[PDB]
């Protein structure tokens, strides 16, 4: 997962979880990618699926 097309003003809300480096489960890539942006690229992907 590449968050270059981010940020995005809105995200759809299907659930396909990703696990961030902050130990938080992100509900989908769009949600994860806006968080990466918001963190100014500090947050990374730990692995796919729930944390």
């Amino acid at each position: 997962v590449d968050c270059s097309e981010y940020p995005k003003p809105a995200c759809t809300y299907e659930y396909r979880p990703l696990c961030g480096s902050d130990n938080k489960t992100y509900g989908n890539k769009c949600n994860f990618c806006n968080a990466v942006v918001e963190s100014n690229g500090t947050l990374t992907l730990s692995h796919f699926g729930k944390c």
């Binding site: 995005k8 003003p9 809105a10 299907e14």
Partner: protein
């Protein structure tokens, strides 16, 4: 199973919007971004209880899909959780509405704008959307937006979250009923 309950496809989890029918044929509505590319739908994460298979899907541009029930024993309630739904209506600015979804449950708020255009990127643009101040989060896609016993829309997407507050866009349900020739019950 009723409006707001989880639904699982091969790829992820969404929420059931509304149970609908045409003649003796039962279907359910959900988001089109959920039905896009999904064939079979199940009631549980184990994929053990089958619900049915996608019969239609419209996304992007619109954001609705319909799945035809192939499970004969599952109860198909014409409600949203316990809430009876008896009819469908058009949203109006200032309308008080409630959403239900499989991740966050039930949250209320009001219609703030009509005919909104939401751009989810990469050519996924949807038009004609109801804007509200109700929050929603991943997993809630496709659940019902209703007002009393009236069906109003299907969760599509938005920003923010339930902790801090958010804006959620919904696809008008009337539009979906008319495209598939089905009705709520």
């Amino acid at each position: 199973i009723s409006g707001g309950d989880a639904i699982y496809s091969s790829t992820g989890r969404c929420s059931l919007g509304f149970n609908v029918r045409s003649g003796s044929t039962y279907y359910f509505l959900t988001a089109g971004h959920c039905t896009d590319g999904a064939t079979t739908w199940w009631a549980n994460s184990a994929r053990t209880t089958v619900l049915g298979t996608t019969s239609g899907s419209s996304f992007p541009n619109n954001d609705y899909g319909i799945v035809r029930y192939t499970n004969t024993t599952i109860p198909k309630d014409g409600t949203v959780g316990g809430q009876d739904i008896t009819s469908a209506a058009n949203a109006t600015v200032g309308m008080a509405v409630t959403r239900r979804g499989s991740t966050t449950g039930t949250h209320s708020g009001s219609v703030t704008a009509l005919n909104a255009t939401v751009n989810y990127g990469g050519g996924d643009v949807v038009y004609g959307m109801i804007r509200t101040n109700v929050c929603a989060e991943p997993g809630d896609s496709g659940g019902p937006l209703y007002s009393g016993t009236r069906a109003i829309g299907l969760t599509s997407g938005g920003s923010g979250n339930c902790s801090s507050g958010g804006t959620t866009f919904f696809q008008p349900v009337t539009e979906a009923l008319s495209a598939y020739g089905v009705s709520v019950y």
